[PDB]
Amino acid sequence: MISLIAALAVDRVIGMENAMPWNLPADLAWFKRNTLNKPVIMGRHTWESIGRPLPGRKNIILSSQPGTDDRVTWVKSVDEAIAACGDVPEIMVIGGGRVYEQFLPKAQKLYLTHIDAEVEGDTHFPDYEPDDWESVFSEFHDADAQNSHSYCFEILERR
Ligand SMILES: NC(=O)c1ccc[n+]([C@@H]2O[C@H](COP(=O)([O-])OP(=O)(O)OC[C@H]3O[C@@H](n4cnc5c(N)ncnc54)[C@H](OP(=O)(O)O)[C@@H]3O)[C@@H](O)[C@H]2O)c1
Numbered sequence: 001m002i003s004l005i006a007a008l009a010v011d012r013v014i015g016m017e018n019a020m021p022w023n024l025p026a027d028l029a030w031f032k033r034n035t036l037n038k039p040v041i042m043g044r045h046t047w048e049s050i051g052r053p054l055p056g057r058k059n060i061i062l063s064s065q066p067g068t069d070d071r072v073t074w075v076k077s078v079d080e081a082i083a084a085c086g087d088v089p090e091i092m093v094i095g096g097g098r099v100y101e102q103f104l105p106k107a108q109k110l111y112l113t114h115i116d117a118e119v120e121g122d123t124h125f126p127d128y129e130p131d132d133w134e135s136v137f138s139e140f141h142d143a144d145a146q147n148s149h150s151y152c153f154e155i156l157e158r159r
Pocket residue numbers: 005006007008013014015016017018019020042043044045046047049062063064065075076077078094095096097098099100102123
């Protein structure tokens with residue numbers, strides 16, 4: 001099955017100038033816990049933003065161009081990216097905006113972190129249809145000394 005995982009600020013903002021402006025270690029820990037030992041599919045811009053492989057995960061990068069790093073797997077279409085994952089229980093799509101839009105219709109599950117941050121961005125999570133999704137997990141956390149915004153971890157399943 002295909003899942004998307006993302007962290008969204010106000011208005012579904014997910015990035016600005018090829019970075020995630022906020023810094024929430026608790027959310028990065030959630031991301032790691034939910035992606036470790038699964039393939040991750042990302043677009044080339046997200047690959048560049050992260051800047052290095054994510055350890056302990058098969059990293060698959062979408063690009064129309066030939067790859068530039070054999071520590072990761074390079075593919076040229078959505079269907080090729082899925083194939084390159086092989087027979088696994090769960091594929092994690094890790095963005096960015098353009099990649100999320102293409103995988104959303106194929107996805108069965110969304111792992112969304114809703115961050116209480118105002119951020120002026122240039123990239124958004126898709127404007128998905130709320131009626132298509134059932135919330136099956138929701139956990140809110142207040143800000144603390146390590147995490148400067150409140151945030152809520154949610155898992156949605158396609159109805
Ligand atoms: N908050 C979050 O959860 C989160 C998660 C991920 C990323 N981000 C942020 O999102 C931003 C990046 O998102 P983005 O929308 O600009 O870019 P993106 O989706 O990461 O990358 C788009 C690139 O992927 C390739 N690509 C995408 N679909 C393809 C297809 N079907 N076939 C072949 N290649 C394909 C293309 O590379 P070529 O140009 O080489 O063809 C394209 O330019 C950054 O700000 C990043 O920090 C945030």
